[model samples]
Target: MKQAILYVGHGSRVKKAQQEAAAFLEGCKAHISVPVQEISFLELQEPTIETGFEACVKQGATHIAVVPLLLLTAAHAKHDIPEEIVRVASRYPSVRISYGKPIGIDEEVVKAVYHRMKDIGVPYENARVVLIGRGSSDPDVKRDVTGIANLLQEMVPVKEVIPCFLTACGPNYKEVFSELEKDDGITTFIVPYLLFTGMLMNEIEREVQKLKAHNPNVYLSSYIGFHPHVKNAFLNRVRETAANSEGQFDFDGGSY
Candidate 1:
């Protein structure tokens, strides 16, 4: 059976953002021994899923491994991506498609977060770590963030690890910032759980500036982008999907 690997990334309007993702995929692709490998975006980018799938089929791949290059298990991972995959797979009835999980709730993620915190070079004691997510309406997103934060708290020396969102969820960045404004006894670390740079990073910096004026101890950690641990986590998902022979996109049953 000829096998292929299709990586689907959350697209962006920014050129740099798109390039960063492609570069990361290139690095990962270099390591994979698959006969056919392709990169595609979920939306707002070139080389759509259908295009990538067609590319695989053109190269004589019978089984395609579809891996969602997402940081969390949100609606996108749960429904949107699979929906797109189902649509594409319908056109290629002879080809097989296997879907894999995102970088969801992994210890590698916790290590990546801790690695970023180490870059901050600040005392974790008596400090509040505000783990910022891109945010989604899905409950699983929040739940996963909370679980990861709990795990990170146990690994690090921080006083507390708090999970907050950028939008479409409760306890947003600004809301968390407002609370930090009132307290001067502890330092506040804002660690954005993002894959790459974008407008969202700009917004986080702006909010951080507001807090900086009031609290001198506030620190902003860099976004979790292309870290080694992140690469390992993503590659793990890709490898697992390629090994397992399950049919991930079953349109009739509405599951992936």
Candidate 2:
């Protein structure tokens, strides 16, 4: 009756980035009793989806749930992850493997973003906030960012919550910050909507630091990944997905 929960992430070439994701997975051990594994979809990481799934089965897991740690349902979520799941599931027909939704669309994610903003002393009222995502080629990913921006706006006096990207889309950070400069806003906070810190975060920090050098009015907050609340968000996503699965499975509170 053993079950396994595999949290898959987009891997990075940097060793630290890989380690960071692995560290986050370690934290999940306190919340759930099942075997938890962290796998990557790209280079510089081990236990690709195939390896992780097989390991779970070897560990006596009759059921496995693959939960994507990605923020949005981009190509990785919509196509890549599912394709990988299908490929791996074929190897063990008796062991049920269910795929879960990405973390971007979750309600808890919105709350976490708002709380991060508050933590950084960004007023929810009468402030122009920019929600910066990692960016994606998928249009739905862009839409999701905008949707979250709109939702946050309603809660606060938010004059505008612009969606900016780091790459793979329009309105890059420089463009968005430039636009904000032209506007008359006393406080502009650039919030990183990423799940982990590494190269992407370093680039964002460097950009924000350069911007601060000339225009001291704007502030850059920390990456959203390290917050403890995020652990809750991830765990909730796992539980919800497991509950929705159709076949027989075993979830040791934290497993699939």
Candidate 3:
């Protein structure tokens, strides 16, 4: 039976971002044997989940493994996406479907962030590192973000790693920085924990000037957009899902 790799992504309205995600997934062909690959967006894009699922069936994929291109087990990963998968699975009762987890604080992701930091020569000692994520009301997701901060500390010499949010969360980077020892006058590195570039990245870039006005030492760094390691991390998820999955809707703690 033919197998397919279905990559589910948080689609972007930005042409460049959409192109990057599509190109990156398509680029995975060299790494995996699944000749049938399809890309789908959750919103703001075409080839929605329904369309992607349909494409896989049409391509003669008796078995399909779906992978989420996310960083944490947030609302999307925990609920919204599963509902989508279950709904899609209902259409093809005979087809086998399996869902995969996101990039939840993996070593590859840590390495990617470290390399991004190294590009600008930001020394860890006497410096404060702030990781800004797309904040969530989900408490578990918040904890996951904090866990990522801890992992980054292990990879670098930074004395402190602070996790902040863009919205609906506690202690935006500045507030966290203000709490640090005032006398140290620490140089802050604000790293956006974003996967790609878009309006959010632009918002941060625009804010950089205002931030610099308050303190030039407070620098904004680039996101992990279109990084080669992203492809590697994504493949890991693909392989893991392919190996463990057995049949349709075989996720959600059910034994295969």
Candidate 4:
């Protein structure tokens, strides 16, 4: 059977963000041995999931691997993407489809975060890292984010790492920032726990600017995107899904 890998990235309204996703997926294509590989977005971009699935079918893909390029298992990973896959699979009765999981909670991801903070040249041993997440109504999202923070603190030299949300959850960045005293003599590094650039990241920049005068020790670290470890975590998911023959039938109109 001809194998195909279909990567679905979280779409963006920003043109450059779309380009970044496409380019990142291209970097992954060389490693997979599949004959057919295609890229698409979940929304707000050129390629909808339907077109991507059809592209695989057009290329004579007998077995297709549907991989979600998501950082966490949220609404998009748990509900929206699966629903879209079901709709697309119904149109193609013969082509097999296997669903892949998100890049969830890898130790490599924790190391990537540490490296991201390290790249800023900021002394993190005595620093308080504000790990900001995109946030979700899903309780597991909060759990996973907090779990990452715990892992980072355990394995790294950082003093403390707190998980905060941008929306839809408690202990958000604003609250964390307000409570942190400027005169505490400790450094605060804000590391956005996002996969790519977006409006939320822009908000982080603006917030840091407004606080810079008051809090000189506060620094903004880079978002976790295209880090080598992240790329490997993504590849791991793709490889796992490509081997999962059982998930092929799960896409046919059933709760996943």
Give a tens-digit lDDT track for model 1, residues 1-256. Answer: 8999999997888888899888898789888999899999999996898899899999999989888899888878877888888888888898877888888888898999988887988877767899999888888888889999999888777889999999998788788888887755788888999988778999999989988988888999999998999999999899988888454442243763
Sorted on lDDT, best first, the list reads: 4, 1, 3, 2
User: The CA-based lDDT of model 4 is what?
Assistant: 0.87
Backbone clash tally for model 4? 0
Give candidate 2's TM-score.
0.83
TM-scores for candidates 1 onward, in order:
0.92, 0.83, 0.88, 0.92
- Residue 138 displacement in candidate 2 (angstroms): 0.8
* Span of ten consecutive residues with least summed lDDT in model 1: 245-254
RMSD of each: 2.1, 4.7, 3.1, 2.0
Clashing pairs in 1: none
List residue ranges in candidate 1 displaced over 4 A: 245-256
Name the lDDT value of residue 210 in candidate 1.
Answer: 88
Query: Mind giving the per-residue lDDT tens digits that candidate 2 earns over 1-256?
Result: 6667877777776777777887886677567666645454533577687887787788888767777777787777766667777777777778866677766655667777778778877565667788999787888888889888887777667667888898898778779776655435467778899876767889888887777766676778777875666677788877766654564332222212
Tell me the whole-model lDDT of each prediction, alpha carbons only: 0.86, 0.73, 0.77, 0.87
Candidate 4, RMSD to the unseen true structure? 2.0
Against the true structure, candidate 2 has what lDDT?
0.73
Q: Model 4: residues >4 Å from true position, as ranges?
A: 245-252
* Tens digit per residue, CA lDDT, model 4, 101-169: 888888889989989899999788878899999888898899999999999999888779999999998
